[PDB]
Structure 1
Amino acid sequence: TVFRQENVDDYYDTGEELGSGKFAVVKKCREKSTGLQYAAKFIKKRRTKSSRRGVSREDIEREVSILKEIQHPNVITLHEVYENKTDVILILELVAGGELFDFLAEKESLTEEEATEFLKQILNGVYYLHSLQIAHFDLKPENIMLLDRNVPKPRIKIIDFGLAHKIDFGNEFKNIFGTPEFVAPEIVNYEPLGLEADMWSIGVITYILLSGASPFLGDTKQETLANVSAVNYEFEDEYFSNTSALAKDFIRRLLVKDPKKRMTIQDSLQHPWIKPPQFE
């Protein structure tokens, strides 16, 4: 698919850099015709087929196609897409309250209430995506952003659809590997992947929300990956002595090696606690 080839600067004014990735730089921007603000994600294009720099057009188109499908309070939306010789520029819904990762860096540990407040929103967003057979494949606190970080119960949106795939056969068997701390054992072992990998990542996110500690993190990437494949984690009494056993049960049912035995997004919402890149 071809995108708009007018100069983006003719229609938007850019401001503060919001962040950057392996693939993109994201800048705050304001649309001239409406005064509304967006996050413009500039993704650097591959300059030759065999190149390793930039992102392949196939990968860019996949992120755009998925984003175009989404409309839900807990996920970002796509406003417009532009392109030029060097970049594809996605005009995304702006999430102005920063990453959950930075919010956590301030607070250390949350109460079970504060953790479940975030978690319910995360689960509602993932329920939406999984209902559409979209696996995110890179869920982590850096990919959850807050609309406003200065309210007692911040509202969130899931971002970063750079590894997201449609799972039309229940599993995909391609080159997909996210952040070692958060990937499921099937990613580590290069097995067919499905929606279940996100559910694992949610277990890791929950463990971190409650304790401020990462359950599989080793001193090198290979150690983290080996810990993940072996399901080498435990609830340290120093961090979890005052956490409810029901919270631990929720985590235990997500951090399961066999994807078929892992709780699904529907199971996670009915669970009693809730129910009301890889190389060095």
Structure 2
Amino acid sequence: WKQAEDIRDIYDFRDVLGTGAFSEVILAEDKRTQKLVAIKCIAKENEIAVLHKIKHPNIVALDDIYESGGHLYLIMQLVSGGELFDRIVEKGFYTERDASRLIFQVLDAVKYLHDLGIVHRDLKPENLLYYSLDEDSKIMISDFPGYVAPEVLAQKPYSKAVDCWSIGVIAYILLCGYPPFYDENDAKLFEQILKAEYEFDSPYWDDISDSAKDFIRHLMEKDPEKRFTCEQALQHPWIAGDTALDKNIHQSVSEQIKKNFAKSKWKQAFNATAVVRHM
């Protein structure tokens, strides 16, 4: 931990990244290189030391660590592309290939974690942020209901296989815009979930490839042992192959996302403008 008399000796603070979760992260400029960075102040060790060495293209890195006063300052890798949903909703052209490249990157990052012994456990659409505002931008896993694995809910010993269910869920949403499990009152929803009751609904899933449906089923498998490992999912023709279609499914997906994942801009927002403004 590089000691520092004051973190401000090293970085010039700008604005916070957004609201909710994002208000805990400070955008700042590296005085020396003028490089823009995200900074989380952990008031005050091994977890952090572990994180420090987790290196993957699609996970948000912890570049450096500085200790100043009674706090730990985690200099994080900065992303400026904003939230997954925000971007897709404003895409205009979205297809199965786009969804598959997204799922791929997530599996690529997650398998990386599993090999590293780590299990995410809390993997959902909110944790995915576009590296940048570029169209070819890669999706990144930031932090480190229907999303949470069945065996978890059932209070059974979780496995690394929990992450793979979550990914199947995400894949589902990326192909239709609505969650695969929903019901008025929780109790009725929870049985649907704990029993893996879901469907590639008639209107919505009319132009989705059977392959995608198959890929999903195997991840969204109630039986943990019958469930695709991150490696198997990566071997599936939808991911490693050429089965993903390039038909624009933006309309239904976009339409469903707005109805299903609506929330205030003051709730838990990533102020992409603040980054690009100082970019």
Indicate which of 107, 130, 149 corresponds to 1:123. 107
Are the counterparts in 1 of residues 12 and 28 from structure 2 also a CA contact under 8 Å?
A: yes
- TM-score with structure 2 length normalisation? 0.77
1:89 lines up with 2:73 in the alignment: yes
Residue in 1 that maps onto 2:196: 231
Are the counterparts in 2 of residues 109 and 210 from structure 1 also a CA contact under 8 Å?
A: no
In structure 2, how many angstroms separate the alpha carbons of the residues matched to 1:219 and 1:43?
39
Residue in 1 that maps onto 2:141: 158
Alignment of 1:1-280 (within 5 A): 4=3, 6-21=5-20, 25-43=24-42, 61-62=46-47, 64-82=48-66, 88-107=72-91, 110-151=94-135, 153-161=136-144, 180-219=145-184, 224-276=189-241
Q: Which amino acid aligns with 1:210?
A: L
User: How far is the alpha carbon of 1:67 from its aligned partner?
Assistant: 1.7
Q: 1:87-145 CA deviation, whole Å, 9 max, x = no partner?
A: 54321111111121322343499311111121222221112111111111222221111
Describe the SS at the equivalent of 1:238: coil
Residue in 2 that maps onto 1:171: none
In structure 2, how many angstroms separate the alpha carbons of the residues matched to 1:6 and 1:105?
45
Describe the SS at the equivalent of 1:117: helix
In structure 2, how many angstroms separate the alpha carbons of the residues matched to 1:101 and 1:87?
34
Residue in 1 that maps onto 2:251: none
Larger relative contact order (C-alpha < 8 A, sep ≥ 6)? 2
Q: How many residues align?
A: 241
For structure 2, the residue ranges without an aligned partner over 5 or more in a row are 242-279
User: How far is the alpha carbon of 1:83 from its aligned partner?
Assistant: 5.0
Distance 1:34 1:150, change over 3 A: closer
Residue in 2 that maps onto 1:53: none
Q: 1:226-245 CA deviation, whole Å, 9 max, x = no partner?
A: 43212122111121111011
Distance 1:225 1:89, change over 3 A: farther
Q: Which amino acid aligns with 1:41?
A: K
Q: 1:65-102 CA deviation, whole Å, 9 max, x = no partner?
A: 34212112111211223456775432111111112132
- TM-score with structure 1 length normalisation? 0.76
In structure 2, how many angstroms separate the alpha carbons of the residues matched to 1:100 and 1:196?
23
Are the counterparts in 1 of residues 16 and 22 from structure 2 also a CA contact under 8 Å?
A: no
Compute the RMSD of aligned alpha carbons. 2.6
In structure 2, how many angstroms separate the alpha carbons of the residues matched to 1:126 and 1:264?
10
Which segment drifts farther, 253-262 or 243-252?
Answer: 253-262
User: How far is the alpha carbon of 1:6 from its aligned partner?
Assistant: 3.5
Distance 1:113 1:85, change over 3 A: same
Residue in 2 that maps onto 1:56: none
